[PDB]
Design a binder for this molecule. Sequence first.
Ligand code: HEM
Ligand code: HEM
Lengths: 165, 165
Amino acid sequence: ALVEDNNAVAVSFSEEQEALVLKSWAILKKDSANIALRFFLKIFEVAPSASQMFSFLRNSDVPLEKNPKLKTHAMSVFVMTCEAAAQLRKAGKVTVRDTTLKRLGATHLKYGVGDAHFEVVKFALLDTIKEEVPADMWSPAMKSAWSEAYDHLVAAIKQEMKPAE
Amino acid sequence: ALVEDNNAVAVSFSEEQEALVLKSWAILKKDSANIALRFFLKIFEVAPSASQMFSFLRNSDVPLEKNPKLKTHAMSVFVMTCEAAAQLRKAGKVTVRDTTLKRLGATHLKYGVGDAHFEVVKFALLDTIKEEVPADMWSPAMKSAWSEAYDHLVAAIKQEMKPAE
Ligand code: HEM
Ligand code: HEM
């Protein structure tokens, strides 16, 4: 991040922001299957080519609604973004196991996932949360808390998607 | 016939669909500068990396996008999509001058415009039209009319973005 970019940036993420992510996630969990669905239907609406990276041959599950990869993937983005918030809050940086990040970098690079894709997914995530939590709790602050967590997780993954030259 | 496009084969774009595109475009014209703006602000919101393919900021000492290059591109997508609808209606295929398509293929390939980009722009176009025309005229039919026009125009352009058939 070019706010004081060198090799170690100030990843300020407050307890309030984590709280925002935690209580909204708490409500979203009460209906996991449904939000995961809405989440991927939104990705597919914005970038059909994205959902095409998941296919459906092994399961042969053609319908998007029955594409297991989609549900599992939707949950991974939420859960890992929600953990990234907690990590930013406690450690000041994403702390995904080295092996786990290397595996995420390789997988996404292997599927041609680029910046626009990460951005569309973020847009769909934020849209899905806004659409799912009560209007009394959504706020720009909640939107930003999620965005910060997501953005940092993505940056960590992208790091294992290029040469550490 | 889920083949991306149809260089000249079967495609039934009706007079009603063209009418839908024409009258909505008619209303949108009455406020070109504003819809072009909302249109690109939407692209940037969904895929910031997209708007990064054009130019930064410089025009008349103001942050908001006053860059004439944007309004130009926004208008080209509308006008050419609107013309593609008329062409699908009259000829059953996009009829952009051979030289004009070659120039569009080369330009977009040269800028790394990919499938996700074309999809985000389509999403922003559809969102902008829905947001701009009166609720009494927007409908799934109008959305599809625009989508069909846009999709075929894009397929025509993409054809000049890859080695000959
Ligand atoms: C921060 C956001 C993201 C997170 C946390 C995430 C997480 C994951 C995880 C945990 C896997 C499972 C495989 C493994 O263990 O490596 C995976 C696979 C995959 N991801 Fe993501 N992903 C993210 C964004 C994206 C985006 C933007 C796309 C593309 C639109 C995408 C496409 C895929 C594909 C196609 C696979 C492999 C195919 C499969 O699931 O079998 N991911 N992702
Ligand atoms: C069907 C949709 C599209 C149409 C009709 C369209 C049309 C045009 C036209 C007419 C030009 C002017 C240059 C020339 O004569 O070749 C152009 C340039 C360009 N387009 Fe598009 N475009 C479309 C989609 C996109 C998308 C999806 C992006 C990327 C998000 C994009 C990015 C650009 C860029 C960066 C240029 C060249 C830079 C410049 O304008 O100087 N276009 N486009």
